[PDB]
């Protein structure tokens, strides 16, 4: 018998607003040594983008951005057209790549076909003020205004007094310092230069601290957030994925402080669900999907303005993997994130479940979309308890229902959002769509465990609307 629950949505609540440019990937730095991958010509790859929002936003940073260097007089051959870089694991100094002229020049071809902006990470770690002046000049000219959203100077610069960036002393004042060196450089040479930061990696008593001392300098805070870790670790399992943690908690009560505090606005600009590259057995599987789509509306309804999921290559958390060369594929992850294009832009409302204490980690977010209609995301993420859930304060002659599933929660494939997979280059249409009636503002919606739910409300009276 399932567990059940009550729903109720308060339309008279509003929260937060969900913008257009919500959702987001994060990549590697050292990506950009292969001028083929983020290219015009990587029609694959941009066709997935797409589908995941007509607007969004490509992070590119991480670990590798410390060991990046842009190369303006670069042999073009310095390229590697064969990488497919996937998610720095954090255990050494990675390679050293080169940033060529042609790989900032297919970058903005990729952007304008994906029609998403960019977040690009600058050299702070290892490379010159200077270099960084130059490398910014080259990108601000050649993606433009419109398109780059910020510049971060450095990749988790709170982890720099433990992963030899840095001396074992090096602290938030020490990257103050250097913050403020690159930064006049870079504004000298690029006078209109946007920034983001600090791009900390967990460190949260580094975000008002930040946003206080640059604040007339940034456009947007950033901080990361994994929820497992490390991967070798048998205590980190799709179970606990399921569930909050003092990590999450704290990240989204910083990312409050840093807002309320500041006025600016927060992003999560690189997150995923383990770190140090993700798990086989966890990452990879159907309830990464669950666990994605739920911290995409949780950290909305904190405030958060946006997300980039880090992935690459065939990373076991990649939302998308692959290569130019023997195409892509939409993992497990992927599906989480579609459930969220398909629910789109709108204004949450407040959505309060109770009664659930016997299927505690169902979670459920209502919309206004911006087309008016009222749309709910559920994610059963009970994994052993089917749900059945009493929606009240929705005033619709009937909903439809699309459903996230797998036939098993560790499940590395399989996965069908609407009853269809995803296809080629990110093509998807729902192939299974069930019709819910409703009286009174009333309905009930039956999941099983370890599923997830879009539901989309009818307009009123609207049959014969064109």
């Known amino acids: 018998s399932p567990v059940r629950v009550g729903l109720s949505v308060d339309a008279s609540a509003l929260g937060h607003t969900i913008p257009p440019d919500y959702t987001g990937l994060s990549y590697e730095q050292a990506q950009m040594a292969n001028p083929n991958y983020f290219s015009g010509a990587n029609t694959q790859l941009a066709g997935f983008l797409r589908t995941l929002g007509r607007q969004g936003v490509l992070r590119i940073g991480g670990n590798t951005s410390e060991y990046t260097f842009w190369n303006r007089h670069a042999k073009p051959t310095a390229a590697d057209e064969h990488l497919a870089a996937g998610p720095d694991k954090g255990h050494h100094a990675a390679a050293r790549e080169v940033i060529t002229p042609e790989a900032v020049n ?10 998403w902006k960019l977040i690009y990470g600058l050299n702070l770690g290892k490379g010159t003020p200077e270099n960084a002046a130059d490398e910014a000049a080259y990108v601000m000219e050649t993606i433009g205004a419109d398109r780059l959203l910020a510049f971060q100077l450095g990749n988790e610069p709170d982890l720099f007094y433990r992963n030899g960036i840095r001396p074992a002393s090096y602290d938030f004042a020490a990257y103050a310092g250097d913050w403020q060196r690159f930064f006049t450089a870079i504004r000298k040479r690029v006078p209109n230069a946007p920034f983001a930061g600090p791009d900390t990696a967990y460190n949260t008593k580094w975000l008002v601290p930040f946003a206080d001392k640059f604040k007339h300098d940034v456009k947007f805070i950033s901080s990361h957030y994994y929820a497992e870790g490390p991967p070798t670790d048998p205590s980190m399992t799709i179970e606990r994925l399921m569930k909050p943690n003092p990590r999450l908690l704290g990240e989204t009560a910083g990312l409050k402080q840093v807002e309320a505090d500041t006025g600016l606005p927060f992003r ?28 995409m509306y949780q950290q909305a309804a904190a405030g958060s303005t946006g997300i980039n999921f880090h992935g690459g ?16 594929i939409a993992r497990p992850e992927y599906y989480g994130m579609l459930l969220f294009a398909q629910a789109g832009a709108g204004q949450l409302l407040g959505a309060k479940l109770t009664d659930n204490s016997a299927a505690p980690l169902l979670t459920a977010y209502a919309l206004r979309g911006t087309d008016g209609r009222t749309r709910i995301a559920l994610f059963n993420k009970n994994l052993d308890a089917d749900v059945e859930v009493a929606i009240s304060g929705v ?21 069908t959002f609407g009853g269809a997979p995803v296809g080629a280059s990110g093509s998807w249409s729902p192939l ?23 539901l989309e409300f009818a307009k009123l009276a609207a049959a014969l609307q064109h």
């Open 106 to 115: 297919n970058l903005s071809e990729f952007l304008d076909k994906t029609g």
């Open 313 to 328: 290559g065939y990373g076991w958390y990649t939302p998308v993997a692959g290569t130019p060369e023997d195409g892509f």
């Open 432 to 454: 299974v769509q069930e019709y819910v009636p409703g009286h009174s503002g009333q309905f009930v919606l039956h999941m099983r465990k370890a599923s997830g739910a879009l």
């Open 268 to 295: 999560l600009t690189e997150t995923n669900s383990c770190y140090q590259g993700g798990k086989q057995g966890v990452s990879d599987t159907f309830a990464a999907a669950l666990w994605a789509g739920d911290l």
């Open 395 to 415: 005033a619709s002659p009937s909903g439809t229902v699309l459903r996230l599933e797998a036939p098993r929660a560790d499940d590395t494939t399989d996965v």
